[PDB]
Amino acid sequence: ERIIAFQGRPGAYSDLACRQARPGWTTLPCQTFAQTIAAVHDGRAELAMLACENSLAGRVPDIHALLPEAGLFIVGEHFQRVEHCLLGIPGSTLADARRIHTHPVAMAQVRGIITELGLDPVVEFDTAGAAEMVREWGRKEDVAVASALAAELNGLEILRRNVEDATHNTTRFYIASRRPATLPPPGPGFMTTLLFRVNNQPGALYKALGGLATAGVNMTRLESYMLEGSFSATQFLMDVEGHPEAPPLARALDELSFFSEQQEILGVYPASPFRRKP
Amino acid sequence: RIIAFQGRPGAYSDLACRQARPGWTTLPCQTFAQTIAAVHDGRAELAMLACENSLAGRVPDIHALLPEAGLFIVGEHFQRVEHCLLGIPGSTLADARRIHTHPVAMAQVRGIITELGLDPVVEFDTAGAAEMVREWGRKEDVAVASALAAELNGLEILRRNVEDATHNTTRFYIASRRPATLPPPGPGFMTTLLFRVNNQPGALYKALGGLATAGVNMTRLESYMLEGSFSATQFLMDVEGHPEAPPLARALDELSFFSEQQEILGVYPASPFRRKP
Ligand SMILES: N[C@@H](Cc1ccccc1)C(=O)O
Ligand SMILES: N[C@@H](Cc1ccccc1)C(=O)O
């Protein structure tokens, strides 16, 4: 209660996401995605911040089976423009830096500053760990690339904010809670995430979508999954604008039901203002 | 003759490499970026990249990183994940008190946990659990991991096909450095491609119309956000066929009318696993 679980360690971007999307809430680090969900299921946390999409690259969990099983429900989403800081020890400076420690992907994103300062790349497991290691070692020669939060929590100094050579990466998250008794009341500005299955024949998916197109309903995400021991059908996770008990989505879903099987609502939640921000 | 994979020795990805390319030296890499880098740099011929799981699993996002390493999907592989209960040399089922494995695996083997009255101890992955059980001398600790993990860590298999409650199958892309030409037109091929359509109702629907009426069957489809730009959406699509042969050839020309920046990520044989009971 007032606790939000996330996957990773303190100062991870997921941690920052929690503090961005729910300021004042205590964040609960979990090492595994399964533990993150388990925290909410068991009552150790109210919410879970689960990564779902990255514009460039990232590690995201497969929620298609695990989330409905043990009965979570997407009650929100959150967008994060990932901001890389170059972190050093309290008394350090840019000139001291010789070796740079961070995640493989981050290292690619900051190739400019590596060449600029002539640094030696040292790839670590994640960004938060690189921040922790730089603190632990106490060497001014070693710097980290990690979140500004990782600097705060480990008492490191920010040698430079915004080290990305371009905007590069944005991360989208689902915010999941224990399944609520009723859905949010019909209204504008809602999103809906659902599962459905169609057969393995040419226009099977196409048909299922027909009702969405002619009804003017816009899809924001779609992703297919294999079925265990069957190549005869295919399951889909779909994000669509709207609320299932309000037009124009309500009728569109009735049509979808005619051309699909085992439809299931994973979440009905407010669409983030980030979607309409320049 | 070297194939890179993500994980540590005895991981199911490692087993996949040995299944799909027997006799090839496998190159463990800790990160997905390192796995692709190995092929880009010439440290490996191929890369075994996990792409799908029927139940659950950790898969990389290849949509940007793979084309940008200049790689190209030249094959696929399906693996029915087979869990072995592993103990230290000379141990037995009776000795076992604690059981170590990945969260998902632990769920799949709830039967044997209750059967032997074991204490579940969840680890990061299966290969690590095998390594830990070896490292710790202790007959009280057993692992659930691949048969390969047992071999490479000198552990004994206490039971070979530990029944899963709900089984898992893992699908992989096999990527190499972009070849000069495509495989010659013929039957049994699959094609993976990237395309973009606009953020309007029916945009995707239109792009697919040409596939449906042309009798071309899709096996996978997955959307991605575009950095900044909230105006279009990129898709990865697996479809049956070869882009220089009907019925796919013409279907793709139509798809091009309703989409942008079409790109072939791979053209590769469809695994016999797709038609196996
Ligand atoms: N094979 C079906 C369903 C499907 C669509 C897309 C991806 C995977 C499966 C079709 O072509 O419509
Ligand atoms: N929004 C477009 C394309 C799209 C589909 C699915 C996910 C994202 C984008 C449509 O409704 O057809």
Residue numbers in the entry:
A (entry chain B): 4 to 281
B (entry chain A): 5 to 281
Give verbatim lines from the article.
Structural data together with a phylogenetic analysis and the enzymatic characteristics implied that GqqA represents the first example of a till now unknown, third and novel subclass of acylases.
DLS and SAXS measurements indicated a GqqA dimer in solution, which is also present in the crystal structure with a rather extended interface area of approx. 2230 Å2 between the monomers. A GqqA monomer itself consists of three domains. The N-terminal and middle domain of GqqA consist of a mixed five-stranded β-sheet with three parallel strands, surrounded by three α-helices. The C-terminal ACT domain is formed by a four-stranded anti-parallel β-sheet and two helices. The symmetry related mate of the ACT domain complements an extended central β-sheet structure of the functional homodimer. In the C-terminal regions of both monomers within the dimer interface we identified two L-Phe molecules. Docking studies applying the native GqqA structure and the potential substrate N-octanoyl-L-homoserine lactone suggest that the lactone ring most probably binds to the polar residues Y16, S17 and T174 located in the cleft typical for the subdomains of PDT. According to this data the GqqA crystal structure we analysed corresponds to a closed conformation.
